Amino acid sequence: TFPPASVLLFKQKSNGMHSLIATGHLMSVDPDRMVIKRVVLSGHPFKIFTKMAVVRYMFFNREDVLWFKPVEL
């Protein structure tokens, strides 16, 4: 659909009670805009030296760290 166009959104409360939630206008329509889903993996630094630290509770194997090695913290 070619812009401009209004963007209403409503949700079934119960038995056809369409309740309005969202409202806006139509941006560029194309599949090229790819969405990136993020995941934060947590940890705890239980040994602390000068600029070097041992952290647990982020993985549980050993070679998991060999799998997620180049990814920066």
Partner: peptide, 18 residues
């Protein structure tokens, strides 16, 4: 085999080239 893979460019949508 650790943090990289193939994932080549194959099969796209119908692009209506202006």
């Amino acid at each position: 085999s650790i943090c990289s893979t193939a994932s080549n460019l194959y099969n796209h949508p119908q692009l209506i080239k202006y």
